[PDB]
Symmetry: C4
Subunit: 156 residues, 4 copies
């Protein structure tokens, strides 16, 4: 049924594997998923964010492996924004994965075939996602999902 | 009496719940509560701080839920500064919450209905606060309090 | 003899207390003691460091409590640099504390009455110091020492 | 045979010691080995990285101890880039050490006498390296290797 398949990130269920093997669009939040969740503001009007290098490679593998990559506000940049893309790309909801970190992402993660919460996501989001990563946001959590998707699709 | 009520952050006492259910003004330090406690100084005269994105949403929920938000030196920006606001807003001390991280905040946290110390606050502050968060400063500790206040007030 | 005295940072020996109660000059490295040990370099020629706000208050308490504060390269800014100050301030070596993080600090920490290694100092430095802090560098380790010195001197 | 030799970083095998005692060229990735793996991008076109101060000293010891230091894209700056240097420096592969953090480094770490993965390297890289550090990238992992190499060569 839905027992454990070993990965280098720890075991996953067959349910998760059957979910990830249908995925063709990966939707990613910025703050708390690709970034540490911090915005580095300065007195001189600066605003910085920190993104992880291992993530950008994970995104490139997925992109060249046939997984589109969208950054909810190169790749393609609430409830309705998700619907505009899936129609614009003609992708079915079962075929979408979503990585978020805040409770304000739940209405979209409720429609996607594979909802993902980063390890240090908002506590109220963790029981809702199909999968909770082992890596924190901005620390390679997106790479973790990217690797698991390619594994589930026999591409890695 | 004052037994445990489960939350997604861990249990809290009924005492804490009875405290948080009266709160209408949340007072927040900057350094070590909304920031990592670090100031990023550069050779070219820059000074930066890092604030957490999950916190800003927690502040917005509280603000739209009827909790004012003040940043001890949009929102409203020692012992006397606290008294000027509470008079200016006509709020009673029992109805104020305070999140700090340093021992130099104790005289104000001693007057408020709900004193809060962040998880990694100064060690000498932790035994004094009504509540110690589970999240570090600049990592979502303010969001933790914001969520607990809305829960205690039946707004979440 | 030299048994344990409880502090809010954990126990210390009477030896440490008898050491800290003679201290009138605290010497502090920058990198890895007041900073996270990181230098934030940018393409546009920037160089940044991150210092902790709880540390600056610890330094101010010590300064107003009668402990001078020197930053080995407001306060007063290898083996010989230490000797120039102690002569210039007429302070005796038994009366000096030193917080470092790297093995290149050992010849000076060998002469001071109270040698201190931060919790995440270079592994080869930890067995050498009179005291190892509980807080990492750039995370309040200097505040920890500052508080312990004032306690040992009955000023806190 | 290949039993444990105590170090201040924890035990290492004699195999590792026999490996490190032949090393004359240390090759280092940037992202995730000397840096936290983060790139700090700002709205105003900035890009920053954070390097560790304890690492730069480790590199200087190695350099003055007879270990060249190369930064795969002062020191000397995929599979073919490695081969160009080893020919240009007339160094034999058994005599090269490589510190990486991502699976895209494995073809080079497969040819070197001492392959090293940082503690928080990509999970798929850890079973491949001759050695896994105890320190994370950008936190002194390069210093750890630098110290172990000098120990293995009787220079420390």
């Amino acid at each position: 049924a839905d027992a454990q398949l070993a990965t280098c990130y720890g075991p996953v269920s067959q349910a998760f594997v059957d979910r990830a093997a249908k995925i063709r669009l990966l939707i990613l939040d910025v703050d708390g998923v690709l970034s540490d969740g911090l915005i580095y503001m300065g007195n001189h009007g600066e605003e910085l964010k920190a993104f992880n290098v291992r993530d950008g490679y994970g995104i490139r593998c997925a992109l060249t492996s046939g997984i589109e990559v969208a950054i909810i506000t190169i790749t393609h940049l609430k409830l309705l924004a998700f619907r505009d893309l899936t129609d614009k790309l003609h992708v079915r909801p079962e075929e979408v994965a979503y990585i978020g970190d805040d409770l304000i992402d739940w209405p979209v993660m409720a429609e996607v075939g594979l909802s993902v919460a980063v390890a240090d996501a908002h506590p109220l989001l963790l029981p809702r996602a199909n999968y909770v990563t082992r890596i924190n946001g901005g620390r390679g959590a997106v790479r973790e999902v990217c690797d698991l998707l390619l594994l589930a699709q026999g591409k890695l």
